[PDB]
Symmetry: D2
Subunit: 123 residues, 4 copies
């Protein structure tokens, strides 16, 4: 049902766009939306660190700038193509758009977002 | 040189994608990048308000997820198609990607970002 | 070892300071730091929603503006004094300052942050 | 009316608390509130860069966790005690709490926030 090799690959591609001059730590993400399209995002840092955009947040922006809908699955990777768990902020924003059933690429098996952010605030 | 009617129109289109169930205040943005392509973004709210994504930040994500480069001009509008000045956070993130010379759609004449965020922190 | 009734009460007090004109949803937090002092925080909203400050983030700011150290326990509550789980963003920021062993007030028993943000990004 | 030497000094003190292991770029802030008390804040970074808290945002949290009110004047400094202009995000959050008349320490003369964030979004 979810081609994880494809999603992960798109996340790996997407990582290539990261604007990460401060950390040099590129992140890409790719998500499958409920209509079968995939949207991607990369890391975008800012001199004011707290204004940096996460790749998974970029994905959510793409989601809504391309017709919205629900996220079914997301892979997040570093610039080396390694699977990354989304930061807590991203877990919260993904939840809004995929709910607890959103699959997040690996550990050794994609995880439900619900398990990555249990007892989530607040709707 | 900059088709502002086009950019503003794209920002107006882009506003249609806003996920704004909390504020009901849709924002769209569209920017011209140095290679002539235009990238767009809309507002994406979250139950945790501080995780909401600005449309202009969505634009910057699109920028880098589509090859990066420099932003030359940006229009930001509300869901009514009215010109909006970017919030301070967006002014900072746009600066990273357009610098002080980035034109921002209107007042009655597009403004340099440099004038919208004078004496900007911090590079 | 942790007076949860005290922490929760301080979180309830702290909620009273929330600047929440947009959501009307007050949040307070109080944390015990490794030296036995307690630091508190409340929700601070902004017209640009994504600039709203979480109460638990306020706590972390207090932590470092009062000598830093490690967070041992945190209660987060709404304006009604109900226990709230921190949003994903707060779970990530708390982790930086309390690690996985940081106790977070309730469900029916305080939880390790590690369990609230399993397999956390990224250090 | 505003003891800027005092505010700047408090901002310099406050900078000492910064949690800045990623950038090593400490920021402190101190603000005078309408009741004459001063509240302070420092920079707090996170591994997820975009979750870093600005010192001026820390100030606003202190403001409301200490009774709220309006900010009259703010100095922001780096770890070297040099005057810093607030990032765009901070200019927006300060505006909510000080309005356009909030004085911001230097260039060679404190500036109105209104001039640092002209034509501000959006209330
Ligand atoms: Zn993230
Ligand atoms: Zn904005
Ligand atoms: Zn939070
Ligand atoms: Zn700032």
């Amino acid at each position: 049902d979810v081609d994880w090799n494809m999603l992960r690959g798109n996340a790996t591609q997407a990582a290539a766009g990261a604007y990460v001059p401060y950390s040099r730590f590129a992140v890409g993400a790719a998500a499958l939306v409920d209509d079968g399209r995939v949207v991607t995002g990369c890391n975008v840092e800012n001199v004011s660190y707290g204004l940096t955009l996460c790749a998974e947040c970029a994905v959510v922006c793409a989601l809504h700038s391309t017709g919205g809908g629900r996220l079914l699955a997301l892979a997040c990777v570093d610039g080396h193509g390694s699977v990354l768990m989304p930061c807590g902020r991203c877990r919260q924003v993904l939840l809004e758009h995929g709910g607890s059933e959103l699959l997040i690429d690996h550990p050794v098996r994609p995880r439900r977002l619900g398990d990555l952010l249990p007892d989530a605030f607040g709707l």
